[PDB]
Amino acid sequence: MTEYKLVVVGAVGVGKSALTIQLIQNHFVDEYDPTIEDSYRKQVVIDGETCLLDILDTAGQEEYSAMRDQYMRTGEGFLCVFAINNTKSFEDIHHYREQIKRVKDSEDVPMVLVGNKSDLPSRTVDTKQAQDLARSYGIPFIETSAKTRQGVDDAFYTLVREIRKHKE
């Protein structure tokens, strides 16, 4: 079985833990608890091929500006997640984009830009901004939401699909 090292990066309170927990145990955690370093492994079937996902939930806090460079190396795919309720995370995506591509030495790094918290009425970032930013990096864009589970599959599914498209 093929394993895929996945790393979820983003700002604080963006929704990295709520997305992975909904992907792992089909549940939604409402009360917020910050991530320091959480590793998850689960078998997911991607296009008729059962593969294992080694998801790494990272800390959006800037207090770990050293361990971030380590796990960004051994990772194969990356989830650049931002909350549409916070416009600072949308521009912070460039910082996570450049810091990963720096420890990768390749403009063609398997990533997908996903937009979380689409169920909230306090939308600040629209689809036109994220669709063009996705065209700026050459990566797909998936609008998600951890509660209603809108496209939580298609976020991780398309990330593994790019890793497969990147390999062969």
Place this chain on the structure above:
Amino acid sequence: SNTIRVFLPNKQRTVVNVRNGMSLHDCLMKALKVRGLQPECCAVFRLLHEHKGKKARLDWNTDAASLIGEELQVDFLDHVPLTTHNFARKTFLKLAFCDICQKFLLNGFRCQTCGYKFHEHCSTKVPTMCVDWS
């Protein structure tokens, strides 16, 4: 610096901060349930990088602050009926129903150990641990 890294079963790991007075069971109960791991079927060990033995078993309700800096490891108890799934392609000739969404299942996947049949787009809703009492 006020945290403890714990290696979880099935080659997983977590890092939790210690609100002092909490036990090892209080600090790790959340990280085990979200991974489909039952705390009653687990033991917490202190990794011994020394000679003759790689870890020593610890009580679940011991103070977590008494182990700050060390590296702990949670492992399944001996011979617990928990394993990993073994998925395979399966075409259901007779009409069958998915175990997740309870809809018509035509071309899906089933586990050869517990029999979990499901749509492909529901494979993420199957429990992460395989219960085997056969």
